[PDB]
Design an enzyme around this catalytic site. Structure first.
Site, PDB file in Angstrom:
ATOM      1  N   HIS A 142       0.836  -1.215   0.000  1.00 14.51           N
ATOM      2  CA  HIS A 142       0.000   0.000   0.000  1.00 14.51           C
ATOM      3  C   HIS A 142       0.872   1.267   0.000  1.00 14.51           C
ATOM      4  CE1 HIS A 142      -3.729   2.305   1.013  1.00 14.51           C
ATOM      5  NE2 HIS A 142      -2.883   3.063   1.679  1.00 14.51           N
ATOM      6  N   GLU A 143       1.877   1.291   0.869  1.00 12.35           N
ATOM      7  CA  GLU A 143       2.711   2.479   0.979  1.00 12.35           C
ATOM      8  C   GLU A 143       3.545   2.662  -0.273  1.00 12.35           C
ATOM      9  OE1 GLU A 143       1.876   4.415   3.169  1.00 12.35           O
ATOM     10  OE2 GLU A 143       0.793   3.003   4.461  1.00 12.35           O
ATOM     11  N   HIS A 146       1.494   4.212  -2.973  1.00  8.53           N
ATOM     12  CA  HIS A 146       1.520   5.682  -2.845  1.00  8.53           C
ATOM     13  C   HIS A 146       2.809   6.279  -3.418  1.00  8.53           C
ATOM     14  CE1 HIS A 146      -2.148   6.394  -0.743  1.00  8.53           C
ATOM     15  NE2 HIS A 146      -1.791   5.744   0.348  1.00  8.53           N
ATOM     16  N   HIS A 152      -6.087   6.327  -3.193  1.00  7.31           N
ATOM     17  CA  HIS A 152      -7.023   5.349  -2.650  1.00  7.31           C
ATOM     18  C   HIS A 152      -8.158   5.087  -3.609  1.00  7.31           C
ATOM     19  CE1 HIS A 152      -5.853   6.434   1.759  1.00  7.31           C
ATOM     20  NE2 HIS A 152      -4.959   5.653   1.183  1.00  7.31           N
TER      21      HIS A 152
HETATM   22  O1  LIG Z   1      -0.920   4.841   3.767  1.00  4.72           O
HETATM   23  C1  LIG Z   1      -1.891   5.222   4.398  1.00  4.72           C
HETATM   24  N1  LIG Z   1      -3.077   5.628   3.854  1.00  4.72           N
HETATM   25  C2  LIG Z   1      -3.954   6.038   4.811  1.00  4.72           C
HETATM   26  O2  LIG Z   1      -5.052   6.544   4.637  1.00  4.72           O
HETATM   27  C3  LIG Z   1      -3.330   5.758   6.147  1.00  4.72           C
HETATM   28  C4  LIG Z   1      -4.135   4.650   6.800  1.00  4.72           C
HETATM   29  N2  LIG Z   1      -4.151   3.456   5.979  1.00  4.72           N
HETATM   30  C5  LIG Z   1      -3.284   2.423   6.259  1.00  4.72           C
HETATM   31  O3  LIG Z   1      -2.440   2.486   7.136  1.00  4.72           O
HETATM   32  C6  LIG Z   1      -3.441   1.269   5.422  1.00  4.72           C
HETATM   33  C7  LIG Z   1      -2.763   0.069   5.336  1.00  4.72           C
HETATM   34  C8  LIG Z   1      -3.372  -0.700   4.302  1.00  4.72           C
HETATM   35  C9  LIG Z   1      -3.195  -1.952   3.712  1.00  4.72           C
HETATM   36  C10 LIG Z   1      -4.078  -2.276   2.695  1.00  4.72           C
HETATM   37 CL1  LIG Z   1      -4.043  -3.774   1.832  1.00  4.72          CL
HETATM   38  C11 LIG Z   1      -5.070  -1.424   2.281  1.00  4.72           C
HETATM   39  C12 LIG Z   1      -5.272  -0.191   2.837  1.00  4.72           C
HETATM   40  C13 LIG Z   1      -4.390   0.111   3.838  1.00  4.72           C
HETATM   41  O4  LIG Z   1      -4.441   1.287   4.503  1.00  4.72           O
HETATM   42  C14 LIG Z   1      -3.268   7.021   6.928  1.00  4.72           C
HETATM   43  N3  LIG Z   1      -4.293   7.563   7.551  1.00  4.72           N
HETATM   44  C15 LIG Z   1      -3.903   8.723   8.172  1.00  4.72           C
HETATM   45  C16 LIG Z   1      -2.578   9.068   8.023  1.00  4.72           C
HETATM   46  S1  LIG Z   1      -1.787   7.887   7.057  1.00  4.72           S
HETATM   47  N4  LIG Z   1      -2.015   5.326   5.752  1.00  4.72           N
HETATM   48 ZN   LIG Z   2      -3.113   5.113   1.874  1.00  2.00          ZN
END
Ligand SMILES: O=C1NC(=O)[C@](CNC(=O)c2cc3cc(Cl)ccc3o2)(c2nccs2)N1
Ligand SMILES: [Zn+2]
Ligand SMILES: [Ca+2]
Ligand SMILES: [Ca+2]
Ligand SMILES: [Ca+2]
Length: 214
Positions: A142-143, A146, A152
């Protein structure tokens, strides 16, 4: 056509404390699984995620704030890199694994954070992952998505590319990922545009000494 991401993998002291002697094997296992996702045909433009350097931890400041931890890590990793991609010690992206419970502004549900569309900018090509012990390869994917300019899948641009009919890597929260389609059409479009537009110019050289699971 063949693209290679020369990756620096970093584990903090908390990772070392927990995983101990099995840490190196664990990180390579996690990265192998993330690499498998980046080769899946659903991504349209596959890339080979190659671990070239592995650091087990002064260092970066790791704390609850995902944002501040990312900024501290990204500043720190710059010092390990070299100016030119032709230098064997040079790396294209840096990923930190920590056992720290990373948080956003109101909740600690987040599992990671990254800069968006930064893969060939050595000052910004950075991601952090909270190691949950089981699904860390999905968070890493996921990271790194990005880092490759992916949004998303519930974003407005993705609605129009994905169609009307939460099962992919770039879902906004972790859910069960479809084995036949880890990447949505939106994810494929965004990485493809990114590379087509020349932002993957540092991914063309083949690494000399990949770290392999023996
Ligand atoms: O990279 C990010 N995007 C975000 O919205 C988030 C939160 N999501 C996760 O940690 C995360 C991990 C993951 C793994 C899979 Cl398979 C799908 C979706 C996923 O989402 C943040 N929220 C606020 C600041 S950062 N971090
Ligand atoms: Zn994300
Ligand atoms: Ca290189
Ligand atoms: Ca968290
Ligand atoms: Ca490179």
């Amino acid at each position: 056509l063949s693209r290679f991401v020369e990756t620096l993998v970093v584990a903090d002291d908390k990772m070392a404390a927990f995983h101990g002697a099995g840490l190196k094997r664990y990180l390579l296992t996690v990265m192998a699984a993330a690499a498998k996702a980046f080769k899946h045909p659903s991504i349209r433009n596959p890339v080979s995620l190659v671990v070239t350097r592995l650091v087990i931890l002064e260092g970066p400041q790791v704390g609850p704030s995902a944002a501040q931890t990312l900024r501290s890590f990204c500043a720190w990793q710059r010092g390990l890199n070299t100016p030119e991609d032709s230098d064997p010690d040079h790396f294209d992206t840096a990923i930190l694994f920590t056992r720290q419970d990373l948080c956003g502004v109101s909740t600690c549900d987040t599992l990671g954070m990254a800069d968006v569309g930064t893969v060939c900018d050595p000052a910004r090509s950075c991601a952090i992952v909270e190691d949950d012990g089981l699904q860390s390869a999905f968070t890493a994917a996921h990271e790194l998505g990005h880092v490759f300019n992916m949004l998303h899948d519930n974003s407005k641009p993705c609605i129009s590319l994905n169609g009307p009919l939460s099962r992919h890597v770039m879902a906004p929260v972790m859910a069960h990922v479809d084995p036949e389609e880890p990447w949505s059409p939106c994810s494929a479009r965004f990485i493809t545009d990114f590379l087509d537009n020349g932002y993957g110019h540092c991914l063309l050289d083949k690494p000399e000494a990949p770290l392999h699971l023996p």
